[PDB]
Amino acid sequence: IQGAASPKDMLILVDVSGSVSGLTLKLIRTSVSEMLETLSDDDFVNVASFNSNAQDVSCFQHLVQANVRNKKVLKDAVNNITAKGITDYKKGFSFAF
């Protein structure tokens, strides 16, 4: 992943809204934590989420370098997420950008 690409600024927009309740949420929480494992130490990441209001799953509020540690905060905050409420792509992309 170092030779194959240049440093990134990832920003995962998990969709924790009502319609992902159930199995779709178990795959989102798994797949997010399976994507934070493709981040080096010289590329940043944050994990937002939106259910008619876009917030952060973690306590970071900006990009956080994806160290061995910063990832653990994000992985452990993604795993403790729950589906609820309507889905709003406008307010959740206006938070990512």
Binding site: S21, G22, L23, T24, K26
Partner: protein
């Protein structure tokens, strides 16, 4: 045929009522964290009619 059609249409209305009520009670409530083996859910109307028919034939 005027009476076969009437009987079948009344049956169809019974199935429609017990499928609208099916969506009202069990709409989207079948999401269990187990693998999605619930093919016969009540989610939308065509998938509710198949489930009500499957119950009907038992």
């Amino acid at each position: 045929v005027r009476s076969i059609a009437s009987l079948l249409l009344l049956l169809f209305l019974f199935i429609i009522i017990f499928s609208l009520l099916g969506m009202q009670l069990f709409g989207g409530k079948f999401n269990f964290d187990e693998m999605q083996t619930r093919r016969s859910t009540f989610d939308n109307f065509p998938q509710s009619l198949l489930t009500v028919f499957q119950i009907l034939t038992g």
